[PDB]
Each structure stands twice: as C-alpha cells, then as structure tokens.
Design a protein around this ligand. Structure first.
Ligand SMILES: [Ca+2]
Lengths: 119, 121
C-alpha cells in the first residue's frame, strides 16, 4: 500500500523520445540521415553506449534504420511514427480529462473549456 | 544546445504531490489531522527527513498547518487547493491540445475526440 515512486526516465529513452518527436513534428523527415552514435553522443553529451541503446530501441520501433556503409536514417515509414505519436498524446488527453472529471469538473464544462482553448 | 535531461522528481515533492491530490479529491478533508512525520514515513516507506521536507513544503503552499503541541492538519482552505489543482490539470489540458494541434491534428477533430472521450459512462 506504500506509494509508488516514479524514477528518472532512462536517458536512452529520453533520446528515443526526442528523436521520435522530432520525426513526428518534421524537424526530421523521412530518409534523412541521422548523425552517428559518436556525433550524437558528442552533440548531446550522452555516453555512446546510451546513444547506441537509444538507436537500437528506435530501430526496434521502426523509427530509424541502418544501411551498411552509409549510416543511420529516419525510416521511410514516417506516417506510422506520427500516428503512434498522436496515440501517445491521445492517451494523455484521455487521462487529463479523466482526472478533471474526477476533480469535480463536469463534462459539459470540459466541452466548453476545450472549445475556448481551441478558438 | 545539448538536450535537457529530466531527473527523478525528488521523493519529497512526489509526496507533496500525493497529499495535495488527496486534499483536492476529498480523500483528506479540511482540518483532518495528518499522521506524524514518523507515521507517514512508515506508511509511504520513505526516510523520515524526506517526509519532513514534504511537510515543510505542503505548509509553504498553505496545504497543511502545523499548530504547536497539537499536530499537523490539512488547511481549512481546501476550496483554494481544489481550484489550483484544477488549474494544474487545465494547464496540462491546453498543453496536450497544443501538442496535438502541432502534430497536425485539426482542432475541429480534437473537438470530436473530446466528445467521444466524454460520452463514456
Ligand atoms: Ca563516426
């Protein structure tokens, strides 16, 4: 019954998040060359092992791919990355609204508020 | 220009957060007596010192009051706390909608989505 403590998000997952969001927001486009593990480690001040762990994760999620001799590239399957991103965001939307109606805010007023926020 | 790295939220502030939400949601009510630092440390399995930092901060935010020789108590001003908690969630709400619009989702769609999410029993 003791409270759950949230830990640091691992640094390698923070970098996955960053690259993924950059793809979703078109800072990084489909088939763009991504820097090397070295260049990323050097630019972000992150241990190369952590960057390599990031890049492995990103590849598993199909956000990036490697071409032998040519380096690491943003996937061509970039619409799929954007949709998964929106889903992360929609999950968050769902959760804030739930916590709002739980805080005593009625739905009809959440509708009004949202309409104001969007106007 | 290195990316910002987000650290662990200090445990004392996670406990500050936990208690304000209980207040916000009427789990703890106005003027309810709070356990001692030692009893909270045993409930939440935290260092007593950490719980002491949490209590000290909850008090700075006027969420709880330590009245000498008697105890530590939830504020009488809980409607204030409920209102700021809502504001926090409302800030989170425009943040997520902002970010959905920037991930290319049209606002008219977000509007429909919110209705769908809200249509649930
Ligand atoms: Ca290199």
């Amino acid at each position: 019954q003791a409270m759950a403590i949230t830990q640091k998000r691992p640094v390698y997952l923070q970098l996955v998040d960053r690259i993924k969001n950059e793809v979703a927001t078109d800072v990084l486009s489909a088939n763009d060359q991504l820097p090397s593990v070295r260049e990323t480690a050097l630019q972000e001040k992150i241990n190369p092992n952590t960057v390599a762990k990031a890049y492995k994760e990103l590849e598993a999620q199909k956000v990036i791919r490697t071409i032998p001799g040519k380096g690491t590239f943003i996937t061509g399957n970039t619409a799929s990355v954007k949709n998964s991103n929106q889903n992360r965001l929609l999950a968050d939307l769902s959760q804030v609204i739930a916590e709002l109606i739980k805080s005593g805010v009625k739905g009809e007023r959440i509708k009004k508020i949202v309409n104001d926020i969007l106007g």
